[PDB]
Amino acid sequence: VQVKEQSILELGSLLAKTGQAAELGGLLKYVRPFLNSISKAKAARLVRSLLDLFLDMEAATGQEVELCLECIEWAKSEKRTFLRQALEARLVSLYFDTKRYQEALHLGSQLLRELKKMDDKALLVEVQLLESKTYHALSNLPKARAALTSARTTANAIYCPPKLQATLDMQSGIIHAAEEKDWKTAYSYFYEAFEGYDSIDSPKAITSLKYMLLCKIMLNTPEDVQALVSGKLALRYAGRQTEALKCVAQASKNRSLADFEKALTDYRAELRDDP
Amino acid sequence: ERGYSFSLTTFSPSGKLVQIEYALAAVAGGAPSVGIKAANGVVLATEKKQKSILYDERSVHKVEPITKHIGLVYSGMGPDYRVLVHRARKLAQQYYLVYQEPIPTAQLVQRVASVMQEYTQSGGVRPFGVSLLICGWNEGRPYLFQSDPSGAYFAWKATAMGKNYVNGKTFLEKRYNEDLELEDAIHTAILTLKESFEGQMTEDNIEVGICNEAGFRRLTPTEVKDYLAAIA
Amino acid sequence: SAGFDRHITIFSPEGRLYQVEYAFKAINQGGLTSVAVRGKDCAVIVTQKKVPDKLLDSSTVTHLFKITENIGCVMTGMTADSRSQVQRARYEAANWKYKYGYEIPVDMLCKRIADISQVYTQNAEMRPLGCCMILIGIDEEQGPQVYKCDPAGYYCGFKATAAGVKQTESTSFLEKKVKKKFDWTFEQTVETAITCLSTVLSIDFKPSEIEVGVVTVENPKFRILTEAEIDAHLVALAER
Amino acid sequence: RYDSRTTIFSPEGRLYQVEYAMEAIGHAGTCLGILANDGVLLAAERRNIHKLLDEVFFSEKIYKLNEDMACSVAGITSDANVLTNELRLIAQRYLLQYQEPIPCEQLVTALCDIKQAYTQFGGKRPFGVSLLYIGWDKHYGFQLYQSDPSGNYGGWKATCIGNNSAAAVSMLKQDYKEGEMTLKSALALAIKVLNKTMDVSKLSAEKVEIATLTRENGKTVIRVLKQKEVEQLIKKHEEEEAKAEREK
Amino acid sequence: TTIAGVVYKDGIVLGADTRATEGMVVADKNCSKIHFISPNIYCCGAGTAADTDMTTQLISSNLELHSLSTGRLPRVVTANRMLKQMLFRYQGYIGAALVLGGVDVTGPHLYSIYPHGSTDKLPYVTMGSGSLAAMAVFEDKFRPDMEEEEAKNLVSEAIAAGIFNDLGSGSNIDLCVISKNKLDFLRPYTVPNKKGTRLGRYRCEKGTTAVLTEKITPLE
Amino acid sequence: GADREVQRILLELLNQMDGFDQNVNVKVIMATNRADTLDPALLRPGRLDRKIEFPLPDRRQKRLIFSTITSKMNLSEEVDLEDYVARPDKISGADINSICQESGMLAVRENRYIVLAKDFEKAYKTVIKKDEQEHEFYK
Amino acid sequence: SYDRAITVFSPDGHLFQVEYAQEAVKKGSTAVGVRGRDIVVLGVEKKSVAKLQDERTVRKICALDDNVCMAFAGLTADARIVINRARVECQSHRLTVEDPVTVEYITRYIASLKQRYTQSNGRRPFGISALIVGFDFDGTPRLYQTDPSGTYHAWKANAIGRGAKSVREFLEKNYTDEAIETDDLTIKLVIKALLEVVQSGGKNIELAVMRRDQSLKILNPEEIEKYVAEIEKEKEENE
Amino acid sequence: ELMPGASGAEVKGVCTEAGMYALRERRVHVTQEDFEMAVAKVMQKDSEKNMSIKKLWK
């Protein structure tokens, strides 16, 4: 009565470890009897891992988005509200990553509309953080700040944010920097985001370090840049990025805009594509 | 209000006995201790940190078992904790002798509460400056209780008293969930010890006991070191 | 704020038992000092001796005693409280031997006598015996133990402990010696104790001013180190 | 002054320690009971449910004493437990001696005698606990008695004790029709009283502790309202309040 | 009633009967006489059954308290000292013949307290009404410093001689083995005599008994 | 009489802040270490509209205070200021200012103008002594 | 000073705690008892129950034995305790001597109990004054007042509690030999004394009558309206 | 309804704080959530942190 299901699980696990686009898309609807035969938590984490690898390796937006709407329709016929909201949040993240400003914005607003009444707050914090990201990417700085402040207020009653806290500090640093008015606070927020990202997630950690070093530049203190690059925590993350920021710090301190333009030509491969 | 903060048999005109509140203040100044009730068991821990490493940590234990499935931790005075352990053992074993059946933890908490509130009945004897955390498993259910110097006793899904107890309680209520597992319960307890440990817990700096369907057992130093490394 | 320091049974605000600390300060009032050091298989106790005059009998003014044939004891504070507490400890050890048929472990003796002192400090019928105790002995499967008891009934084992007027500096010196992680052989333990006393006192004492007791695995009997052997030990320390 | 041990008499005659034991009940949780035509119930407030109380209990403010005796407690927890245990001991001693469930009045008087003895002499602080015993007896059917830390007692058909007790009992006597309430109307009245006396716009069933005593089929059954039952009752009273305000 | 005890090379083996008699009529055929006191010590009782039961639970509770306060495994001398003190407290008014044997840090030990309250350390000892046959075997076939399995069959044949030479013992055999790393509570070790098969059904079917009145009370 | 006069001062303060004849464009700032001992009549909206809490610095606040106090300070020569911040310790901004000042003093005493982990660490240990000196039976 | 100590004489020779307990009665309620030729009556002011109190358990007048009754003024818990003790002692006295307890014996026992409760520290005096009534074996009407000081006294008609002075003066001015000629005259006197202080009438008054061994029945609230109709009738009759 | 036993001055303070919440975002309208957060901020008061002290009374 369950040996066939065990064969299905073995095939699906081998598929997920292999993880090709067609095999993955087969596996989502291939746990059709599995999803309603096992608990919600394991099904949710499995489908979200398939979605993560799906958007991270086979970046074919057309099929992935349609997969997300197929999954929300699935959870709407099967009445998985928590899973529904989780996949809507993942789709908001995907829309932002592919820069679907309006789709992400409006569907995140719709999600938050029904999410305030739900008891989940970690997913609420995620949704609010992504909404603030969207508002910042649309140059709606005050509304992005308001959304971030609401997210931080919600996360004041958070439940153990391993990276959600770090992501929140990083985004608050982004908002403060974009406000262009204060940098010491932006410095502190970037430092906190970097130190939280330590030993958890590497690319986001290096982006946070890049932002912190940029904030150091913006305070017209390149000496602190050359001190921090050799800081004991930057060695594990040292590389092209920190060297590029160090050289732009030198160009700023020497106040040679020719050196600045040479640094930006060097950046063209490293740190000019990054908003 | 000062003339009434001197005896245990006089009611303050507004409130109640002030010596009980002062005993509670003595309790809140003790060693931090956290107990967590998981779905399948309970975990309670405390910090054994003391200066002068000359001290033999193995000599005394803050977590002691009352019977094969009941354990307790305290926060506050030491000798009063030892006396409470002695009285609790005597009471539980009297119940065992009378009934030839392992003592239910609810009755143990009730009886220990009665014995400690007995010291609050009359003057000349100070109330115990110790609050108790009782862990127990029975009838397929993990029980966690707190016993008060006032003799009050109440239940707790997960609590923490002693020094910096408010921050620990906020941490627990921001961490605990009803579907918590035993190992994750130990992780949360050690994290609660950490957030106000002030000085890099070692294997022997803390002391943690665990109870489950297989009775109660204080964790050995090796398992404590393994869990500390796992949390890091 | 204050005024709650009159009765042993009265809790002050912030839950602080003043009179117990008053007794702890009374421990120091004896004006002496004592230290205990434990090795791999030995435990050395040494204490200072002050004689106002030759007129006294030095053989009866010993400050270290013997609880049972293998359990020795040293203590300081008020000497009357000291002798009452050693009498109570001997009574308890004899009762334990009578009831349970085997010698009292040092940890259990400390636990029971600390429970007695706790009951003293819990009810207002007793002055809580303001003298601190250090107990030594050997136990199978655990080796030598050194335990300390105080009027509050707080008992704890020590790798090395101290008491008296120079408590804090003696404890600091003990920590400085134990952090080096050396085996502390019997002669080495004894010499560490003597050096601790001499430096914290800055006196470089004559050998007649110290009483020493030692318990080892090969000599489970609590041997009070006689004048000959203490002379050997500490004048050897001098030349060593 | 005359605020020393309870065995003192103020020059005006007042027993100040007993007076303070009286006013101390105002710090306790609010609990009430009323007498219906064919039923009796006890409603109590769960003042302390912060987030993490296991609720490993049958009832906190309401304590059962006997197949026929039940009470609600209001006072210090230690004295509460002592009083409940003595109540059990006295009731079952009477049962063993007399082979009959103890009359409510007799047990109430026994407790009152103990409480008085705890303030009459001995230099012991009086039990700062006010009780609301509920029970049945063949002599007077359904009876409800309101204890007192002073050692007095009274037979009442409507009484609230705890915080905000004065306003609660005042409105209760304002809205009591003696001899013409069943269990349902009594439940509705108790819920309304709780609405008016608690510090909540919408009281949760968790904060409410209701036990009902009823005699049927020759036996008296004491039951605490289950969570489903208490939530149904509170939702019914909530839509009833909605009906009252929409009609208004 | 038969209680027996030997010390073998490494630990203790205990043998107890299961027949309990009141007066001259047997009460039960499978009573348990090996009494739990400690996870490292064990006792066997004889004489007044209720007295044996209550004294065994009392000493086990006191010894558990002792061990928990100490944290160490209890020693045999401690248990027997409290047992003999409390037995002598009643001065023979309790008819409780108990034999105490266990293993401590000093090694295996085995003591025997008669109901009046006297004890002695023996490598091999038995008591009871059937003590004659057991001790006769104890002098006949017993060997000191003798291995575990041969200890098992030694005690088994000793108790077998006890049951087959005395009326007040048998129908089961239960053994308790004590070792520094082993506790084997064999119960039953080996049934020596199973009740014989019934040849005739007495035909107790329905309708064979009349009744006066009916009364139905539902529950749950 | 003295207590009555103190309470009279308080009552005059109340009646001046929110009395019969109101004030226009007169904002009053009041600071205290023990807010809970203040009269409730003074702690109501219309008199003290905002009761702003000034807690001990938390993590990031510690970093900000250290950064703004060591700014005029000479260089620390690659000192783990972020690690000194990360140490869990209930120290107020006054204590951070102390720590920095004491580090400067130690640098002056040792005659080196650029502090580093040694004298900074001695200053840190010096400032937050918090030596328990507590009999262990309390704990 | 000398007031907060039960067993300490004041410089002017007063046990001030005893007098304070005595004064505590004056804060009770008025209770007047009159003895007639064949009847003894107890008039007490009843606290008007607000809306919910069960008047069955608010008993102010209680009978110690089938031949004695008593009304109290003071703290109700003390009155209940002394009632239990005194009726237990009546039963034990009948155990010892088999004859009905005379009013003198039970009053002496009550006085001695109160006294032994007011001669040592740690024992607060019984702050209640009780009016003991009843008939002896030969049916002689006797009435006794017991004082929280531990003393007793024989009164033909006394009042206790608040306003007891006014009732005392009223009885002084109205107690006559012919006023006790008939049961109705004694009743008229006692209700008049009651309405002196409780002028509302009707309710707030409880009455009990003991005739020559009738095992007194408290006057039930049907003829209190009848008896007060009689009182009002006689009252408009002389005026 | 969100203001059990709140004095009138506290009600005016809630109005003011909702207005300030609107001002902080540089708007001119006040929304329901603004009033809810203003009520939370104004009525915020220190409770008995110690549960054990709070559980002295039943």
UniProtKB/Swiss-Prot annotation, chain A:
This is 26S proteasome non-ATPase regulatory subunit 11. Its main location: nucleus. It comes from Homo sapiens (Human). Component of the 26S proteasome, a multiprotein complex involved in the ATP-dependent degradation of ubiquitinated proteins. This complex plays a key role in the maintenance of protein homeostasis by removing misfolded or damaged proteins, which could impair cellular functions, and by removing proteins whose functions are no longer required. Therefore, the proteasome participates in numerous cellular processes, including cell cycle progression, apoptosis, or DNA damage repair. In the complex, PSMD11 is required for proteasome assembly. The keyword Glycoprotein does not apply. Component of the 19S proteasome regulatory particle complex. The 26S proteasome consists of a 20S core particle (CP) and two 19S regulatory subunits (RP). The regulatory particle is made of a lid composed of 9 subunits including PSMD11, a base containing 6 ATPases and few additional components. The chain holds residues 43 to 317 of 422 of the full protein. Highly expressed in embryonic stem cells (ESCs). Expression decreases as ESCs differentiate. Phosphorylated by AMPK. GO terms for molecular function: structural molecule activity. It is found in: Nucleus; Cytoplasm, Cytosol. Belongs to the proteasome subunit S9 family. Changing residue 37 to A: Does not affect phosphorylation by AMPK. It comes from the Eukaryota. There is a cross-link at residue 232 (Glycyl lysine isopeptide (Lys-Gly) (interchain with G-Cter in SUMO2)).
Swiss-Prot record, chain B:
Induction: Down-regulated by antioxidants BO-653 and probucol. Down-regulated in response to enterovirus 71 (EV71) infection (at protein level). The modification Phosphoserine is found at residues 5, 12, 14. The keyword Secreted does not apply. GO terms for biological process: proteasome-mediated ubiquitin-dependent protein catabolic process; response to virus. The modification N6-acetyllysine is found at residues 68, 169. It is found in: Cytoplasm; Nucleus. Phosphorylated on tyrosine residues; which may be important for nuclear import. CDD domains: proteasome_alpha_type_2. The keyword Transcription does not apply. PROSITE patterns: PROTEASOME_ALPHA_1, PROTEASOME_ALPHA_2. GO terms for cellular component: cytoplasm; cytosol; extracellular exosome; extracellular region; ficolin-1-rich granule lumen; nucleoplasm; nucleus; P-body. Keywords: Acetylation, Cytoplasm, Nucleus, Phosphoprotein, Proteasome. The modification Phosphotyrosine is found at residues 4, 22, 74, 119. The 26S proteasome consists of a 20S proteasome core and two 19S regulatory subunits. The 20S proteasome core is a barrel-shaped complex made of 28 subunits that are arranged in four stacked rings. The two outer rings are each formed by seven alpha subunits, and the two inner rings are formed by seven beta subunits. The proteolytic activity is exerted by three beta-subunits PSMB5, PSMB6 and PSMB7. Belongs to the peptidase T1A family. This is Proteasome subunit alpha type-2. It comes from Homo sapiens (Human). The gene is PSMA2.
Curated annotation (Swiss-Prot), chain E:
It comes from the Eukaryota. It catalyses: Cleavage of peptide bonds with very broad specificity. Its main location: cytoplasm. The active site is at 1 (nucleophile). It is an enzyme of class 3 (hydrolase). It is found in: Cytoplasm; Nucleus. The keyword Nucleus applies. Belongs to the peptidase T1B family. The 26S proteasome consists of a 20S proteasome core and two 19S regulatory subunits. The 20S proteasome core is a barrel-shaped complex made of 28 subunits that are arranged in four stacked rings. The two outer rings are each formed by seven alpha subunits, and the two inner rings are formed by seven beta subunits. The proteolytic activity is exerted by three beta-subunits PSMB5, PSMB6 and PSMB7. This is Proteasome subunit beta type-7. It comes from Homo sapiens (Human). The chain holds residues 44 to 263 of 277 of the full protein.
From Swiss-Prot, chain F:
The modification N6-acetyllysine is found at residues 118, 122. Keywords: Acetylation, ATP-binding, Cytoplasm, Nucleotide-binding, Nucleus, Phosphoprotein, Proteasome. It comes from the Eukaryota. One of its GO terms (cellular component) is nucleus. One of its GO terms (molecular function) is proteasome-activating activity. The keyword Cytoplasm applies. One of its GO terms (biological process) is proteasome-mediated ubiquitin-dependent protein catabolic process. It is found in: Cytoplasm; Nucleus. The keyword Acetylation applies. Belongs to the AAA ATPase family. Component of the 26S proteasome, a multiprotein complex involved in the ATP-dependent degradation of ubiquitinated proteins. This complex plays a key role in the maintenance of protein homeostasis by removing misfolded or damaged proteins, which could impair cellular functions, and by removing proteins whose functions are no longer required. Therefore, the proteasome participates in numerous cellular processes, including cell cycle progression, apoptosis, or DNA damage repair. Component of the 19S proteasome regulatory particle complex. The 26S proteasome consists of a 20S core particle (CP) and two 19S regulatory subunits (RP). The regulatory particle is made of a lid composed of 9 subunits, a base containing 6 ATPases including PSMC4 and few additional components. Interacts with NR1I3. Interacts with PAAF1. Interacts with TRIM5. Interacts with ZFAND1. This is 26S proteasome regulatory subunit 6B. It comes from Homo sapiens (Human).
